[model samples]
Target: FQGALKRINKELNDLSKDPPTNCSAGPVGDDMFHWQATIMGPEDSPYSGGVFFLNIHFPSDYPFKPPKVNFTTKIYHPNINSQGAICLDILKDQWSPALTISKVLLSISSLLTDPNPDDPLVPEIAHLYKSDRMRYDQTAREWSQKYA
Candidate 1:
């Protein structure tokens, strides 16, 4: 427990000092395990100007166990559910202890640029993304402009 707390504290401190280029994260209240994150969409993507909110919940055995992450903001992406739950391999099956908060944020930013239709949370969005890339991109941009 001590080691886990120490590592989490160190990582959180480091992230707060030098946040990701597109986002910021901080612990919620007195608990180091629960964090709130806000990420700006990548500049060239359709999601540009979008500010995404996410909740990060670290497990008791973090670093060994992947943290649970879900978006709090509404996002319209093939790989993100209507409720903003994201479907990313790194946050699920492919997670590794070497992955840091910064890496996770980068992956999410990349996901915005390139959504995975093969493994989608919103099937309709995936179909649209596959069948008509241009239309999908347009809708994404419209949503960003309207909501973000």
Candidate 2:
């Protein structure tokens, strides 16, 4: 657990020092493997005014593999599915050991502000976002309010 502890300690320190503007993350309980996170929706975006909760499960391998993150709060976005799974490449094939929990939270917050409709977890949502952006934003805004 030394490696995990070292990384977690660094994560805690970095977050405390220069936290992401709209996000925060930390361990869920005494266990460092399980973490709880929050992302306040980006201002001027459809998700603005929403506080999204997230769950993160770190593998025993620590930096060797990326943490499995899931949104506990419902979010109406193309890149995030109804099950709260995210479709970001960094969490998958693009992950690097240099990335931190703080970076992941910031990435999610950025996703809320600017969704990647090209690579979507929900095709219909993606189509909506690509076809009728205004409607998509309205729905996303309403859903954010309803779920927030």
Candidate 3:
């Protein structure tokens, strides 16, 4: 727990001192293990003009184990399901101890701009994305405004 705490504390200060583009995060009250983060929709993406929120939970063995992160704001995306679970590889088996919260947010932002339809969490959204790009864009924008 101390190792996680130390790393979390260091990361917190680092984030506070230097924020990433279109992304920001902070602990929820006294619970440093649980953080609330936001990723502003990318300007080049259909979700532009929206603000997406997410929750991040660090395990006691963090740095060794990937953090559990999920969207709190509803969004329409192939990799992100209706339940807000994201199917990003780095959040799963591809995660590395070298990765930090800052890197994860950047990856998520990049994902928003370029969704991986081949490995989608929502099959319907992936199908729409592959079949009708415009329709998918419209739905994503609508969902962004309606929910995010």
Q: Cα lDDT for residue 124, model 2?
A: 95
Clashes of 2: 0
For candidate 2, write residues 1-68 as lDDT tens digits: 44977887788889989998888888777897888888898997999999999999988887879999
Please provide TM-scores, in order, for all candidate models, with all chains considered together.
Answer: 0.93, 0.95, 0.97
Can you give the lDDT of residue 46 in candidate 1?
Answer: 86
Model 1 lDDT, residue 25, Cα: 85
Which residue runs of candidate 3 sit more than 4 Å off their true CA positions? none
Q: After superposition, how far is residue 59 of candidate 3 from its true place, in Å?
A: 0.8
Query: Which pairs clash inside model 3?
Result: none
Clashing pairs in 2: none
TM-score of candidate 1 relative to the true fold: 0.93
Rate residue 37 of model 1 by lDDT.
92
lDDT of 3: 0.93
Superposition TM-score, candidate 2 onto the true structure: 0.95
Model 1 scores what on Cα lDDT? 0.86
Per-model tally of clashing residue pairs: 0, 0, 0
Which run of 10 residues does model 3 get worst, by summed lDDT?
Answer: 1-10
